[PDB]
Amino acid sequence: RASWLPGSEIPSYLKGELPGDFGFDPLRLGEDPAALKWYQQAELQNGRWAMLAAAGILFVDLLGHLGAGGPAAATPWFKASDFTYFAPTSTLFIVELLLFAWVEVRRYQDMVKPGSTNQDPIFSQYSLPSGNEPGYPGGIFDPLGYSKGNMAELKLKEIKNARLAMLAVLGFFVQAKTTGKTPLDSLSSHLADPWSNNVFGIEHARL
Amino acid sequence: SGLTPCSESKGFAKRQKNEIKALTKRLKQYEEGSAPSLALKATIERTEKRFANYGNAGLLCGTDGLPHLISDPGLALRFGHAGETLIPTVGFLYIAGWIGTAGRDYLIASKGEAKPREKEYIIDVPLALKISAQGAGWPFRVIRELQKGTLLEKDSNITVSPR
Amino acid sequence: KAGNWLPGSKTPAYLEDLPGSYGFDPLKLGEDPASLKWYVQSELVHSRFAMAAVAGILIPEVLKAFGAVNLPVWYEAGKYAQESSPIPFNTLIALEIFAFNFVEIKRWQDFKKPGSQGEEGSFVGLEGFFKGTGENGYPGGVFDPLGLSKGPGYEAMKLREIKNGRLAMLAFIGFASQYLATGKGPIENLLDHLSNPLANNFTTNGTSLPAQAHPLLSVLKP
Amino acid sequence: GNWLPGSDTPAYLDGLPGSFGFDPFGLGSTPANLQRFQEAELVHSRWAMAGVAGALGAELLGQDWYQAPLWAVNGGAPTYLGIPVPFNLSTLLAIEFVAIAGAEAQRNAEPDAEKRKYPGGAFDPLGFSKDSKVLEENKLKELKNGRLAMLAFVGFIAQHAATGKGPLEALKLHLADPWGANFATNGVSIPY
Ligand code: CHL
Numbered sequence: 001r002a003s004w005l006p007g008s009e010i011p012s013y014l015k016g017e018l019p020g021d022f023g024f025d026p027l028r029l030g031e032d033p034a035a036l037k038w039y040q041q042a043e044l045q046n047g048r049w050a051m052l053a054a055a056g057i058l059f060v061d062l063l064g065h066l067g068a069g070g071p072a073a074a075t076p077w078f079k080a081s082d083f084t085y086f087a088p089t090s091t092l093f094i095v096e097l098l099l100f101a102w103v104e105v106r107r108y109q110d111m112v113k114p115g116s117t118n119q120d121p122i123f124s125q126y127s128l129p130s131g132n133e134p135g136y137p138g139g140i141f142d143p144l145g146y147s148k149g150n151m152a153e154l155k156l157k158e159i160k161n162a163r164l165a166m167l168a169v170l171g172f173f174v175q176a177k178t179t180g181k182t183p184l185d186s187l188s189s190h191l192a193d194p195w196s197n198n199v200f201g202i203e204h205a206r207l
Numbered sequence: 208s209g210l211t212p213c214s215e216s217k218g219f220a221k222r223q224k225n226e227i228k229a230l231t232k233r234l235k236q237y238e239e240g241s242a243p244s245l246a247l248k249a250t251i252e253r254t255e256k257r258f259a260n261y262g263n264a265g266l267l268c269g270t271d272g273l274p275h276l277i278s279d280p281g282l283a284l285r286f287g288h289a290g291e292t293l294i295p296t297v298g299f300l301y302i303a304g305w306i307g308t309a310g311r312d313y314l315i316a317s318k319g320e321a322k323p324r325e326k327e328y329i330i331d332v333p334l335a336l337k338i339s340a341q342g343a344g345w346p347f348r349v350i351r352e353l354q355k356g357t358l359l360e361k362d363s364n365i366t367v368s369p370r
Numbered sequence: 371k372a373g374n375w376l377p378g379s380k381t382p383a384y385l386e387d388l389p390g391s392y393g394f395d396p397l398k399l400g401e402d403p404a405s406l407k408w409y410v411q412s413e414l415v416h417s418r419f420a421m422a423a424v425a426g427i428l429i430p431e432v433l434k435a436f437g438a439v440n441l442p443v444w445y446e447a448g449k450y451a452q453e454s455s456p457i458p459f460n461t462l463i464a465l466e467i468f469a470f471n472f473v474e475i476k477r478w479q480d481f482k483k484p485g486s487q488g489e490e491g492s493f494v495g496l497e498g499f500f501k502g503t504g505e506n507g508y509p510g511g512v513f514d515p516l517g518l519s520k521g522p523g524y525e526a527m528k529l530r531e532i533k534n535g536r537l538a539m540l541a542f543i544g545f546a547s548q549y550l551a552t553g554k555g556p557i558e559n560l561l562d563h564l565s566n567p568l569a570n571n572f573t574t575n576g577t578s579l580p581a582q583a584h585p586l587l588s589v590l591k592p
Numbered sequence: 593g594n595w596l597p598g599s600d601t602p603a604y605l606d607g608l609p610g611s612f613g614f615d616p617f618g619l620g621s622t623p624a625n626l627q628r629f630q631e632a633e634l635v636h637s638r639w640a641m642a643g644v645a646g647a648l649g650a651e652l653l654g655q656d657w658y659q660a661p662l663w664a665v666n667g668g669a670p671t672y673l674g675i676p677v678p679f680n681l682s683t684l685l686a687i688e689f690v691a692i693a694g695a696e697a698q699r700n701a702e703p704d705a706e707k708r709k710y711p712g713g714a715f716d717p718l719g720f721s722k723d724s725k726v727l728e729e730n731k732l733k734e735l736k737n738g739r740l741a742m743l744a745f746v747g748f749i750a751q752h753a754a755t756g757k758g759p760l761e762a763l764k765l766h767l768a769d770p771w772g773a774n775f776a777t778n779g780v781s782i783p784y
């Protein structure tokens with residue numbers, strides 16, 4: 001059995017049932033089965049939004065560095081709110097909150113009762129396939145035939161990339177707070193002289 | 208009541224001056240640094256601090272130059288005299304209820320023993336210390352016993368003389 | 371039971387099944403069951419009031435420390451609000467007295483008779499708002515519009531509410547005492563403690579340890 | 593239909609006209625309360641038809657709805673359409689009371705239950721009614737068309753509370769500036 005720490009004890013409630021189950025729960029956070037289900041859904045949601053965020057931060061960073069983008073990509077991701085758009089900052093938040101309210105209320109209704117929100121509200125002939133997991137929908141969310149050919153393997157790749165993206169986004173957030181630099185600048189400074197430009201030394205120079 | 212604040216009373220200042228003058232008159236017969244000189248200087252300092260503290264407390268002084276306490280809870284609250292009688296009233300009532308409840312609890316606990324009279328003159332000191340510490344929360348338990356009807360013995364269970 | 375407040379002590383038996391219970395009652399205030407029910411309701415009401423108050427103090431203070439907004443501090447927020455208030459002081463007090471008399475009498479009547487405020491004729495047609503959950507201190511109805519008391523994690527949320535409530539009560543009393551002792555705001559006190567925690571604490575504010583009661587303070591100093 | 597797909601509707605709301613199972617707070621659980629609330633909903637909805645049709649229809653005829661009772665306090669005379677109109681504000685409330693309270697007193701004197709909600713008879717000209725097949729269909733049409741009408745009228749009051757202007761011209765500002773002029777941009781609906 002694969003695990004985060006070989007030769008160590010595994011919690012009894014982690015038996016490989018979950019995708020990406022490596023027995024890593026030193027704090028025993030998910031103990032009751034309902035809390036574990038909520039944490040599985042939260043891990044999937046946070047990981048997918050972190051994958052999108054990592055892609056969106058890395059795409060702007062090379063566009064601003066190489067100049068392939070515009071003046072919008074020249075601004076850092078933490079200074080992108082100071083850029084001027086066609087709409088002010090107040091209205092964009094409201095429309096995205098409304099669209100997210102609709103989408104996430106549909107998702108939460110699936111989470112409470114599986115298969116409850118599986119039909120198009122305005123088209124009675126368009127329905128999602130039955131046997132849908134709360135975190136793994138079907139139909140129009142998988143327009144390509146990708147859920148044949150080791151569904152179990154593709155869930156493991158999803159959760160692995162999700163965890164890596166969550167760590168990368170947290171690294172973006174922390175490196176912006178401490179160094180005040182874009183991620184590619186931090187990567188170049190580490191690739192300049194790594195033995196003095198890392199978390200040690202820089203934070204010792206910060207002090 | 209026609210009184211004046213002690214911080215602006217001429218009799219109060221005259222009394223402070225006279226007391227300091229009497230203590231200084233006693234002070235001049237001793238050499239500096241001796242024990243009577245140090246004791247009299249400490250008394251003088253205590254006198255000055257006491258008169259300053261009584262002036263700063265908002266106490267009202269009569270024509271005699273002496274502080275007069277205000278005990279009506281209305282006049283004390285609307286004129287800043289609640290520290291003279293009202294807050295001491297609350298403090299005393301809390302401590303007195305503490306003592307009475309501790310005594311009642313000890314008596315009731317000793318009533319259930321095989322020799323109830325033995326605990327009244329040979330004190331169960333650990334039990335008395337435990338009950339005494341539990342007397343801090345006396346108003347809650349006492350008010351609950353009053354509402355429950357367990358605070359009072361029934362009149363049919365209390366002896367009376369023929370009428 | 372969530373645990374033991376004093377490991378090794380004999381916890382009282384009447385606190386075994388309460389939510390948020392650590393067996394803590396050294397004064398035996400909750401030994402009577404009616405007292406225990408009344409104090410459960412009282413702890414919940416105090417907890418929720420302190421919860422909302424500590425939120426309304428700390429979240430504006432944290433946002434001001436981050437520079438997001440500029441709101442008046444909590445000990446002076448009454449002054450700047452009353453000057454811009456369309457409703458003056460006395461009628462605000464009277465309205466608060468009326469509204470709280472009404473809602474607290476309704477809460478009290480539900481405590482005395484559970485579910486009584488949800489019966490027919492209890493309100494003027496709107497008694498379905500307050501049918502009750504049959505539990506002391508957990509009303510439901512309009513007070514639970516999202517309906518998460520029917521969820522599986524209801525017992526965990528009860529424990530979360532009570533512990534955050536005790537933390538919030540201690541936090542508000544800390545805010546009040548820290549203002550009364552230091553004269554500054556709570557985030558200012560936190561930053562002063564983080565700058566020099568040995569020298570910036572309650573032992574040096576000049577209030578919490580009076581000089582007359584502690585003569586060694588002026589003696590054992592450089 | 594269903595107000596929230598997948599949610600379990602209450603059992604006592606089944607078979608009602610205009611029913612979507614929307615009662616999360618259980619207000620109509622008691623049948624005596626439920627019966628009165630249908631009359632309350634229908635009367636609120638029917639009065640919302642008159643309010644919206646009026647507010648919108650008058651200004652489609654070039655007559656704001658907020659500016660309509662603005663000749664009594666500041667000074668002037670009542671005017672309907674273009675005809676010079678008699679009576680005064682003090683006399684208008686006298687005819688207001690006798691007409692409406694006289695009509696509303698007859699609204700609840702009947703011992704029937706369906707007649708308090710759906711009168712019929714002298715209140716249904718141009719036929720209609722008949723047996724069942726279209727009466728229930730416009731029973732559903734009445735509650736749903738009435739439901740936007742009271743939402744719009746509250747929206748009429750709330751918009752003028754935030755902007756101080758009319759609803760028809762504020763519609764024009766929503767087409768002129770769809771992203772820079774809405775309820776989020778003004779510093780009234782959402783502060784800070
Ligand atoms: C939780 C209640 C509460 C507390 C702790 C404070 C505390 C404070 N207020 Mg404040 N206020 C409070 C409630 C209210 N205030 C105000 C209106 C103002 C103004 C306009 C100002 C303050 C200011 C102040 C500060 C000055 C010190 C003071 O006035 O002590 C007051 C201490 C109290 C404890 C007040 C009494 C509150 C009371 C206990 C609430 C409950 C009473 C009920 C009748 C409950 C009775 C029992 C029930 C079961 C029947 C201080 C931080 C001012 C200050 O900054 O200038 C120097 C300032 O200008 N307050 C209103 C509007 C009606 C309140 C509503 O409840």
Ligand SMILES: CC1=C[C@H](O)CC(C)(C)[C@H]1/C=C/C(C)=C/C=C/C(C)=C/C=C/C=C(C)/C=C/C=C(C)/C=C/C1=C(C)C[C@H](O)CC1(C)C
Binds near residue numbers: 636660
């Ligand atoms: C159902 C239930 C269920 C659960 O359980 C709970 C809850 C959620 C709470 C609930 C829901 C709800 C709703 C939201 C309510 C609201 C409403 C409406 C809005 C009313 C109206 C109401 C509205 C209507 C009446 C109306 C009115 C109208 C009027 C006529 C007006 C008039 C006007 C016009 C003509 C114009 C002129 O020139 C002037 C005037 C005169 C001014």
